[PDB]
Design a protein around this ligand. Structure first.
Ligand SMILES: N[C@@H](CCC(=O)N[C@@H](CS[C@H](CC=O)c1ccccc1)C(=O)NCC(=O)O)C(=O)O
Ligand SMILES: N[C@@H](CCC(=O)N[C@@H](CS[C@H](CC=O)c1ccccc1)C(=O)NCC(=O)O)C(=O)O
Lengths: 220, 218
């Protein structure tokens, strides 16, 4: 059979959460890197992109576009999306808050430097007073190793990935949240995630301007 | 019965109203009128992220639009029949939500950006989103987007067609199969009742309602 093909460019961007999720499932995948605006145009003209956008993922006979369609399919296929509809609602509620915070962080580099540290200061405030207490409260509520159902789920994977990006932005932001610290350690120590965290994995670095201008030339 | 917590406007709650109505589910709305009433919900712990939309359903206090919709869609069997059908649906509705998001945020755009944003919305409507969804319908020829059966993808898409009509009734004119889907879904019994006067369906957001919103969300 065929292992899934990730079509993006060589950066975190909107593909990284899927890299984390497939790796944590222990699924091997290939990446076909888009290197120019002409590579993007070839995927368009070939009819591979429903909305002429990437992320695109070739899996199980489909060409899935949209971040949330790809992740939902992968999370369901590998039993990381809860056991029932109610657990799914909890998972979805949790991960969509994570998506909201992950979005602000993702779009820090290509905001006008006129507003960067105004935006960054509000990202930091929402972390300390809104998102980090919300999840710490969830972990305190049940005292189990995983956010939902006492079983590893996509919520745990998505949250811990964001914990890493929060650490990159301000390492002190986690310090008053002991249960988030512990989750971060336990999840990072799962053999699949620990491999993915070790060098030479498909995990991607933070975006420098070198790759920000590459993304500028590919997406115009 | 489900209890919808939002303010008296479309906002991020309308697509839930549409989806519940199409599934023939009666609901109550608890309208927020002040920032005071929003803080009542927050301090009472009802909002996980201190935000609405929030829906009381089946014992839970679900915030996040997509958590609400995904749960209602599965409960009332509008999420397809397997995860490959849910993946087609998800790919479709996320395109819809991308365009819907642009339209939802037009009135709150900075006034100097509004001419450009509206032009862009129309360009993507005409060249990206409507051709994408017409090609789906032309590809299998069926009356519904997925599985030859009604699903949330049809409901979300038709809802968005009404917002495109309000913005520019010419935009759908070159897309015959979208037109026919709009009328077919409009004439489904539960949807036809929702579209009629006096339903919970909300109007476009005028000036008064928009500054009601800013006061509530400080
Ligand atoms: N809802 C969808 C959205 C899909 C989407 O916006 N894809 C984009 C590339 S990501 C972006 C590009 C940089 O400027 C970036 C890359 C790095 C950092 C920040 C942003 C794209 O393909 N743009 C082409 C076009 O819109 O025509 C989904 O979640 O999948
Ligand atoms: N990801 C989440 C987001 C939830 C979300 O952003 N809720 C907001 C109200 S909607 C917005 C408010 C107007 O300024 C509006 C309403 C009408 C028109 C345009 C914008 C809220 O509660 N804001 C309080 C706060 O953030 O402190 C979800 O999709 O569910």
């Amino acid at each position: 059979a065929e292992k899934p093909k990730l079509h993006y460019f060589n950066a975190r961007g909107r593909m990284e959460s899927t890299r984390w999720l497939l790796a944590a499932a222990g699924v091997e995948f290939e990446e076909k890197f888009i290197k120019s605006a002409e590579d993007l145009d070839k995927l368009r003209n070939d009819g591979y992109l429903m909305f002429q956008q990437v992320p695109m993922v070739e899996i199980d006979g489909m060409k899935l576009v949209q971040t949330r369609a790809i992740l939902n399919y992968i999370a369901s296929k590998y039993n990381l999306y809860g056991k029932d509809i109610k657990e799914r609602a909890l998972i979805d509620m949790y991960i969509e808050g994570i998506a909201d915070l992950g979005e602000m962080i993702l779009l820090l580099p290509v905001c006008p430097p006129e507003e960067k540290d105004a935006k960054l200061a509000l990202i930091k405030e929402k972390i300390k007073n809104r998102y980090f207490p919300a999840f710490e409260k969830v972990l305190k509520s049940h005292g189990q190793d995983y956010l939902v159902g006492n079983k590893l789920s996509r919520a745990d994977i998505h949250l811990v990935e964001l914990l890493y990006y929060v650490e990159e932005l301000d390492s002190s932001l986690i310090s008053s949240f002991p249960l988030l610290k512990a989750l971060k350690t336990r999840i990072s120590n799962l053999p699949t995630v620990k491999k993915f965290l070790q060098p030479g994995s498909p995990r991607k670095p933070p975006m420098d301007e070198k790759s920000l201008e590459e993304a500028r030339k590919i997406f115009r």
